[PDB]
Every structure is written in C-alpha cells, then in structure tokens.
Amino acid sequence: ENPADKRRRLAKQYLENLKSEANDILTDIIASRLKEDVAEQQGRVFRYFGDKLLISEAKQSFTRVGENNLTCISCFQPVLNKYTFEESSNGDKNKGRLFAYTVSKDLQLTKYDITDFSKRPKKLKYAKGGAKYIPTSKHEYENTTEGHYDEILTVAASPDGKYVVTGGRDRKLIVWSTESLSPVKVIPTKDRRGEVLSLAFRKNSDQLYASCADFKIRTYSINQFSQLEILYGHHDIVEDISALAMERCVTVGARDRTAMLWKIPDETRLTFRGGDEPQKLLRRWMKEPLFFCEGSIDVVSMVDDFHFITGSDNGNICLWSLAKKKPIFTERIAHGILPEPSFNDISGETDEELRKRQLQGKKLLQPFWITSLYAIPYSNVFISGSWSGSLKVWKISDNLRSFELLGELSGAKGVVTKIQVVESGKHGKEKFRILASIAKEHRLGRWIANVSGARNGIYSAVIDQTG
Amino acid sequence: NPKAFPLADAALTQQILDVVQQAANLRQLKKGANEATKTLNRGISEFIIMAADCEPIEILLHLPLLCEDKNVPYVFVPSRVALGRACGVSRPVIAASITTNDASAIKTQIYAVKDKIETLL
C-alpha cells in the first residue's frame, strides 16, 4: 500500500528477472547489468555489438508506397524505465507497439506498425494536408491552420508516446496525437523565412530542438506547447540537427561548412571546422589520385557525449571528439565517385573522339553525397546512405580514433532520406531493424530526377547479433 | 584540348560557389543561360559561371563568345546540380551571372576572385 513498498516490489520482480536471465545465459553479471542501466542513464559509448553482427544474412525488404517524395520517418520504440518500472509508452493496448511516422512531400503523415521483424510495416493510419489549410491573412504572425498547406519536411515523435511533431516549408510546427492524428497544437515560427529544416527531441525527454532555415534554432516545450528558446549563430542555414540525453545539440550548416555543438547549460556553443587541403593531401600522397574539397557538410549524428560524425557532400565522413578542433578521423569517398556521364549526351556531335574529349577523362568526376547518416545511440556502429542504393554500415574502434566498414546493403534503391534503428529481443539476443524512408529526390530541392529504379518507400533490413 | 575551357580545380570551384550563394543572398546573381545572355547584352554582368554536364556543352558555349566580345570573364563548374545547389533552387541551373552593384559589401570578395580568375585565364 506504500509507494516505497511498491517500488521495492517492482525491484524484487526486476531482480528476479535478472537472476532468471542469469541462469538462462549460464545454461557479478547482475551487478554488471545494473551498471549497464546506469550507463544507459548516462555514459559514453558502451554498446559494443560491433562484432556480433551477421551482415551477410541481413534480410532485406523494400516497401514501395503510393505517396511520392518521402521526406522523413520517425521510429518510436518504447523502452522500460529504470527509475520507475511501468513503460515509456502511454497506453495499455500498445504494450510496446513499435511505431513509424513517415512524412512525404504530398503533405502526408502516415503511422505504421513495425512491431514484427519478419513481416511488412503495416499502414496503421494517416493524415494528409492540402490547399484548404492555405491561410487567409498571408501576412501575419498567425499560422494556426490545423493542417499543413505546403511541403512538409520533417517529423519527430515525442519519447513519451503521446505526441508527434511535424514541420515543413509552411513555417509551422503542428503537433498531433499519435492515435487519431488530430492536431493537438500548432506553433507558427512567426517569420518570413523561418522554415522547418530538422527536429531533435532530447533523448528520454520532451525537449525538442528544431533546426530552422532562418539561421536560427528553436527549442520547445511539448507538454506545455510553447517555444522555450531560440539560438543564433549559423552563418548559413541550420541544415541538420542531432541530440542525445543531455543538454547538448549539434547542428550542421552547409555552406559555412560548420558543426555547431550548442551547449544549453551555458546558452553557449562550440565550433568545429574541417579544412582538408588538396595540395597537402596530394603532396602527402606523393610522399606515400583525386582529392575532393569539401563543398558542404550536411549530416551529423552525435554518437556520444564527446564524439560525433559528420557526412559532407564531397564524400567525406569526419569523426570528431570534443577535445580537438580538427576532425579526429576524416574519411575519403564513401559511396564512391558518381558514374561518368555519356559522350553523346555531353557533346551532341557525331565525332566520337571529340565526344570522349568532352568527357575529358578525370576532370568531370564527382563523388556521392552522404545523404543520410544515422548512429545507434551509445553504440560503436553507425550507418550512412547515398543515392548509390548502397547502405554502408561502419564501426568505430574502441579508442575512438577511426572507423572501419562493416558492410553494404543493396535492398534500397535511390535517395535514402531517413534512417532509424530499432532494437528488440532479450538482453542477450538483439534483433535490429534498419528502416530507411527513401525517395527519388532530395528533401530540400529536387536537383535530380533520373535515378534508375528509385522508388518512394521504406527499406527494411533485419539483422541479428550473435557472438 | 576539349571545348571545355577554363574549368577550375576543387578548391577554386568551391570558393566561387560560395560567392554564388552570398550573391544570391544579396540578390547579385541572375539565373539561366538565356538570362545570362540578356545581361551580357545589358552590360551589367560582371562575370559568368557555367556548367560542364549539360545537354550539351554548346548551348552554354554560346556564352564565352559574347564574353570575349564584352570583356567579361567566365569559368566552368563540373556539376550543374552543384551550380543549382549554390544558386539555392530545386532545379539544376547550368549558367549563372554575377552582376554589378557599387553599394555591395562583398565587392572586395568579387574583385578578389576577379584577380584569381584573370590569372587563371
């Protein structure tokens, strides 16, 4: 009848489960599991499954959808809490229903069940906008139209399992219920160029950080439905965002080529720049081919409290620590160079030697942009993706100074837009579902239309771990 | 020697695309090959960026001729998708034009790349 007694009773059931699982793995370690719970609560990179994976048997399954130009997807995975012991999900009929929330440029948000790793993601529900949510004033701070009216771009599910937020090119943030997909609130950015770029919930909390196109970032309070803070300092658009359990938030701007590590505790920020020189790289190679200068850095995943990875546009993948201003491990062309165009199309003249002369050999080769890049939280592995149709997973070393390619997956076709990983199973065995919303065009602008066999949909790769 | 005359290396190409974004932000860059020909006729294009991967090189090779006529230098980018991305637009532009404006705070930058571009030519 007493809450301390009930907490102790839940702890008794917890330790009973711990000892029975210990007996199962047997057919010290319990305190190790407790310390694992503490490391989950806060720790550095501890999930060290970078060798137990079986990538060659990873079952691949592409899912074509009717909606076109998928922009983002958000997986909700309910986890059991450590301090309390009910769940992180809200309802009872859920009981840990793995959810997916996809937003597509047809102004459509769609929720799926992905609770099974052998079947296909089931289209649970949906909500589509339109031109009836076109606002009447078009010149004021009021943008409270209950649906979206222009070019949704990004989505983020709240970790409590109660709400889902959506933002797009209509400079609005509409948060909805996750069951009826009813707009529970809408926050206008109160801007002319305040378009929503990318969202970031603080892990295990409602603290949502919105990277926005007006060179500023807005942090929100979701339960109270307001805008807590705005932070300024980006010289270019605040292109991508990443967050973790504590009050740090990394944002990449493209054309200043900068990684801002914003520190909420001080209100302040830290800076990171690259600067690979091709003449120095070529002179070093002569001391030992092509060397692509960094055009734009576009994607970040904050892999730890002290480390983050950044995929740029010229093929570079840079791993960073908080100790150094330099990238602690840059990486050259990841998905290879783009295939060279054709002679007849580049020249339009019957002279084939002049056609290959216009092909020019090496001077027209470009690399693949790392379009999407997702890291498993507090793990030693990460995944990258381009429009090569080759999802490339790598693992970082233990000393956190390098990463090596685990493998490639070819079930996806075209511009992969958003990647998420869902882990399931008991403590010992872990099945991982790698889901990727993938379209034929980039989410920001079109810039390309001819990718052979690129489909609008989601690619699912289910892998197990064993070792 | 192909018809693809001056095409910069990686770092030079990077930095002109960065002046491309800043001039598109300050409304100092015009978009399109036909519009580039128009401002060539206008005499207000200060220099020209063009592509190399178009359908074909010729519809933008019509521009260097008028460039040597109206002493307005020019260079090539490898990727027109990259050129439209630095233009800041969903479609790949193949030809863009840096104009003239005396009350522009980036004019030292443009005169800098003008020195570097003339030493390239």
Partner: peptide
C-alpha cells in the same frame, strides 16, 4: 557543333510535340 546530332533534334521535336499534345 561541327556535326550536329539529329537524335537531339528529334528528341527536341519530341518534347515540343509532347507540349503540343499537352495542349
């Protein structure tokens, strides 16, 4: 072009006729 490509001429007329059909 010293030796023009009637393939490009024909596909250009094809896009023109696609617009004419789009009328």
């Amino acid at each position: 072009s010293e030796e023009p490509s009637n393939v490009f001429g024909s596909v250009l007329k094809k896009q023109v006729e696609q617009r004419l059909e789009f009328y």
